[PDB]
Amino acid sequence: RKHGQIPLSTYLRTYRVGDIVDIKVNGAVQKGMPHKFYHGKTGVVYNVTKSAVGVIVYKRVKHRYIEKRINVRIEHVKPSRSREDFLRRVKENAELKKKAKAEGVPVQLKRQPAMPREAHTVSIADNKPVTLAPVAYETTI
Amino acid sequence: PTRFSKTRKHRGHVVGMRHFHLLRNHYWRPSINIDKLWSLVPSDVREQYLSGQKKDTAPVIDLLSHGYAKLLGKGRLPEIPVVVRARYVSAEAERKVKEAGGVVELVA
Amino acid sequence: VQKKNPLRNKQIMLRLNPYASTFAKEKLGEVKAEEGKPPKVPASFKELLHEA
Amino acid sequence: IKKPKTQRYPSLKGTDPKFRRNHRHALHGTAKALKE
Amino acid sequence: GIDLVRSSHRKAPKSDNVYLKLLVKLYRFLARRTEAPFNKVVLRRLFMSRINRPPVSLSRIARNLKNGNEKKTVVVVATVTDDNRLLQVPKMEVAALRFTAKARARIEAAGGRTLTLDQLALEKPTGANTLLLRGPKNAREAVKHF
Amino acid sequence: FKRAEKYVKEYREQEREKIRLARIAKQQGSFHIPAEAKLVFVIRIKGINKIPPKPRKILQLLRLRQINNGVFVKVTKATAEMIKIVEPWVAYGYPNLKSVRELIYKRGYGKVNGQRIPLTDNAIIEENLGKYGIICIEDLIHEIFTVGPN
RNA sequence: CGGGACCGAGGACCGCGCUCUGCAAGGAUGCUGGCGUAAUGGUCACCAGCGACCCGUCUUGAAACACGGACCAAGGAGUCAAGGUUUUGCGCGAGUGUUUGGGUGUAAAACCCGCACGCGUAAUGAAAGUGAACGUAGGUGAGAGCUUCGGCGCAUCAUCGAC
RNA sequence: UAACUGAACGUGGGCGAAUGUCGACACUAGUGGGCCAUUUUUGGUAAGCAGAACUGGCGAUGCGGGAUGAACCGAA
Numbered sequence: 001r002k003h004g005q006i007p008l009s010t011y012l013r014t015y016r017v018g019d020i021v022d023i024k025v026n027g028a029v030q031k032g033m034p035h036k037f038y039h040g041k042t043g044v045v046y047n048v049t050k051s052a053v054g055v056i057v058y059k060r061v062k063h064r065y066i067e068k069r070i071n072v073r074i075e076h077v078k079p080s081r082s083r084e085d086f087l088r089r090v091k092e093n094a095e096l097k098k099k100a101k102a103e104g105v106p107v108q109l110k111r112q113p114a115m116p117r118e119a120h121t122v123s124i125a126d127n128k129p130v131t132l133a134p135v136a137y138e139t140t141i
Numbered sequence: 142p143t144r145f146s147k148t149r150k151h152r153g154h155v156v157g158m159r160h161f162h163l164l165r166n167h168y169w170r171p172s173i174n175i176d177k178l179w180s181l182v183p184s185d186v187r188e189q190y191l192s193g194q195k196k197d198t199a200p201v202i203d204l205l206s207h208g209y210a211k212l213l214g215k216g217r218l219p220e221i222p223v224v225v226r227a228r229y230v231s232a233e234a235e236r237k238v239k240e241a242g243g244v245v246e247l248v249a
Numbered sequence: 250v251q252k253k254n255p256l257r258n259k260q261i262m263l264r265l266n267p268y269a270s271t272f273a274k275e276k277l278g279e280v281k282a283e284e285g286k287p288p289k290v291p292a293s294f295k296e297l298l299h300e301a
Numbered sequence: 302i303k304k305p306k307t308q309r310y311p312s313l314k315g316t317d318p319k320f321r322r323n324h325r326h327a328l329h330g331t332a333k334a335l336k337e
Numbered sequence: 338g339i340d341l342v343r344s345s346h347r348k349a350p351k352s353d354n355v356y357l358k359l360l361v362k363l364y365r366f367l368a369r370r371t372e373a374p375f376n377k378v379v380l381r382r383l384f385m386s387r388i389n390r391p392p393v394s395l396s397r398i399a400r401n402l403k404n405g406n407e408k409k410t411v412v413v414v415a416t417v418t419d420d421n422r423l424l425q426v427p428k429m430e431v432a433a434l435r436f437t438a439k440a441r442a443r444i445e446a447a448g449g450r451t452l453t454l455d456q457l458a459l460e461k462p463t464g465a466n467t468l469l470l471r472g473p474k475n476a477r478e479a480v481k482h483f
Numbered sequence: 484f485k486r487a488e489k490y491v492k493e494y495r496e497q498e499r500e501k502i503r504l505a506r507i508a509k510q511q512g513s514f515h516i517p518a519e520a521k522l523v524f525v526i527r528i529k530g531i532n533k534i535p536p537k538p539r540k541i542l543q544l545l546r547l548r549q550i551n552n553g554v555f556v557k558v559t560k561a562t563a564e565m566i567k568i569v570e571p572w573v574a575y576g577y578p579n580l581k582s583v584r585e586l587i588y589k590r591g592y593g594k595v596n597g598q599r600i601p602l603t604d605n606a607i608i609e610e611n612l613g614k615y616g617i618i619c620i621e622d623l624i625h626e627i628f629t630v631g632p633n
Numbered sequence: 634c635g636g637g638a639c640c641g642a643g644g645a646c647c648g649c650g651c652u653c654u655g656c657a658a659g660g661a662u663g664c665u666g667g668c669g670u671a672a673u674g675g676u677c678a679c680c681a682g683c684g685a686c687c688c689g690u691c692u693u694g695a696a697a698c699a700c701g702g703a704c705c706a707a708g709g710a711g712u713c714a715a716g717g718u719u720u721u722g723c724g725c726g727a728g729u730g731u732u733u734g735g736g737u738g739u740a741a742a743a744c745c746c747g748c749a750c751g752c753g754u755a756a757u758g759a760a761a762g763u764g765a766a767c768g769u770a771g772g773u774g775a776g777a778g779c780u781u782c783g784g785c786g787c788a789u790c791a792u793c794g795a796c
Numbered sequence: 797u798a799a800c801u802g803a804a805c806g807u808g809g810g811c812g813a814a815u816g817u818c819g820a821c822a823c824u825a826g827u828g829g830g831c832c833a834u835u836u837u838u839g840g841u842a843a844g845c846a847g848a849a850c851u852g853g854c855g856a857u858g859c860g861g862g863a864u865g866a867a868c869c870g871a872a
Binding site: 016017048089090093094097100101109110111112115 | 803804811812813814
């Protein structure tokens with residue numbers, strides 16, 4: 001973050017109850033600042049007020065988790081891209097499953113991890129392999 | 142019994158103000174609620190009253206004879222006129238007796 | 250009451266797999282390769298193989 | 302350190318009183334609408 | 338060596354009542370040879386202790402008899418208790434382990450019928466058209482101190 | 484019977500097809516890279532003493548709670564990271580058809596109602612896996628070897 | 634296709650099967666010999682091979698140190714009363730508790746009886762005092778069971794209300 | 797909100813990575829500033845060493861191997 005003027009698209013972001021927000025504390029604005037802890041933490045919006053929002057954080061104490069409700073101004077909250085990979089995906093499954101059910105052919109609709117690659121053929125022409133020693137010969141020069 | 146004990150199993154492995162001369166008989170004031178008021182009537186006469194065989198007669202209940210000094214007003218009463226003779230009565234119990242159709246009479 | 254090995258007791262093998270008798274009769278473990286003269290190795294392959 | 306259980310409906314106890322009062326009036330209205 | 342739990346519920350009653358043992362045998366047979374879950378629930382409640390079987394009062398039965406439950410057979414694996422605050426007992430068919438004398442008298446005076454669990458097994462072996470009720474478990478001074 | 488005949492034919496055709504692809508690439512003056520293995524067989528060969536908690540948890544999730552325990556595992560990146568973590572306790576590699584069929588014929592036990600039942604009849608396999616199309620021991624072997632949808 | 638070792642669990646039939654008059658197919662039978670007793674087996678004493686520090690207690694994280702032990706027989710150390718608390722069994726149940734006492738008796742037993750009283754059924758406040766239904770004893774989401782298959786919904790839990 | 801323009805909550809209708817496979821009470825405990833070691837880290841010493849974090853072991857534990865043995869290896 002650069003010193004001086006704060007960008008003004010911070011005030012033009014609309015937060016609603018249930019939205020997932022990060023907490024990135026701006027040093028320039030001292031009003032509405034949370035604790036030293038709860039900075040860099042991700043939480044859920046439960047209350048929306050004129051210049052601040054309420055964030056649900058789960059703090060840890062001893063061997064248990066305690067729900068904390070933190071009132072943070074719009075200066076220090078940022079929309080979290082954790083569930084964009086969920087919303088875009090669930091929309092994409094919605095139209096793809098509608099199209100696949102209309103067409104008739106079943107599809108694999110769950111994301112799959114990296115499978116081993118299949119067999120393929122590599123041509124030698126114009127890509128002749130070069131022979132390497134354990135050390136470079138121009139280096140031994 | 143000694144034989145059922147754990148020792149026999151372990152055989153081998155071992156504010157406010159003060160009230161001087163308080164007489165508890167001054168504050169003897171037991172209370173009965175109106176939902177238990179009809180239980181003081183004997184069972185046969187109670188069933189006659191609740192079934193309506195008695196329409197020209199109203200029961201009179203002395204709470205002091207059964208051992209109660211105050212009539213409290215938790216519960217409901219049927220629409221039968223009852224004379225209740227009591228040392229104390231609450232406002233809600235008195236109210237509920239009057240929409241029941243009876244009367245609360247103060248005694249000493 | 251007793252688990253019997255299909256690789257040793259052939260009756261359990263034919264119980265679990267009725268195709269075992271056909272396999273043994275038709276000798277499907279001794280299938281020879283397809284006929285035809287095999288092409289020789291390309292010279293570039295041997296040159297790359299024996300390149301220093 | 303297991304994650305604690307979360308209630309299905311959080312209380313309106315945390316929210317601002319103006320929106321809480323409006324939400325209670327809306328709940329009474331949808332209650333009478335459902336009863337009708 | 339390999340890098341790797343008994344049950345925590347009753348399987349037999351701790352009581353030595355011979356009649357209770359007969360009831361346990363009958364409902365064990367019923368729960369084994371029938372598909373109804375009612376028999377299994379009644380057997381599990383027959384296994385239980387007294388503090389796990391709080392009494393059920395006549396006013397508690399009359400509360401649950403409302404809303405189209407008037408002709409259902411009330412089943413309570415506990416003692417059915419009389420309430421003086423209930424002036425008019427509705428007509429009810431109740432099957433229970435025990436009835437207090439005044440509760441049984443008031444039921445039979447109101448015109449209902451009192452049954453035991455063997456009679457319930459004979460008349461309704463699958464528990465059809467039955468209302469299975471329990472009393473307040475947490476209504477003890479012991480529980481209030483917990 | 485017909486299904487086992489089809490499976491034997493498919494195994495032979497796959498073997499000769501891999502050999503044929505390698506030969507035609509060699510004759511055209513190129514190199515055929517074969518497909519990376521999809522099936523691995525993991526054997527735990529180290530004991531249960533003095534083991535760190537994360538390898539212990541991964542060895543628990545791989546159902547390797549005893550020395551000389553073996554499991555058939557599908558090769559994927561998400562599993563391969565776990566196997567890479569528990570490498571100091573296991574030996575793994577790519578099994579062949581004789582390995583698979585000998586293992587399931589000799590030490591083939593199924594989990595039926597939480598019980599270890601020997602695979603002595605096809606009725607057990609049809610009862611516990613018939614909804615997936617696996618009705619006999621040859622379908623079980625084929626699914627394990629070819630890494631099917633089930 | 635041979636050579637060897639260890640094992641024979643179960644006890645009418647059922648089942649999966651095959652090479653289908655039968656079988657190596659959900660666990661050993663058939664033939665034969667000697668002996669019919671200390672022969673097998675067992676107990677004790679001793680030799681042989683291998684293994685094997687003296688028990689308590691204390692210490693601390695532990696060992697050592699320290700302490701006790703000549704041997705034998707008998708005796709020898711978490712008991713009873715009162716008052717709480719949780720759980721198990723039982724009787725009665727909005728009540729419950731005969732046994733202070735009285736009556737009676739085959740006489741310290743058993744049987745019977747009731748007034749009072751204790752606890753419970755109402756709480757709250759220092760006290761004076763006051764004292765628990767707007768509603769099928771409320772609404773919402775669960776919830777076993779039941780259902781005419783529309784729903785009713787015990788216990789209990791979360792929440793919003795009422796006195 | 798200029799606006800059924802939004803905000804929540806309902807009414808009705810339609811439809812998702814791998815691998816493996818419990819919760820709440822009641823009552824009663826013993827131990828809760830011990831030893832050793834790997835790894836990481838902070839201070840030092842002439843050399844020693846002193847501290848912290850995680851993990852494993854021991855105290856509570858037999859067995860095979862280190863000729864022998866609290867801390868080693870294998871294995872419970």
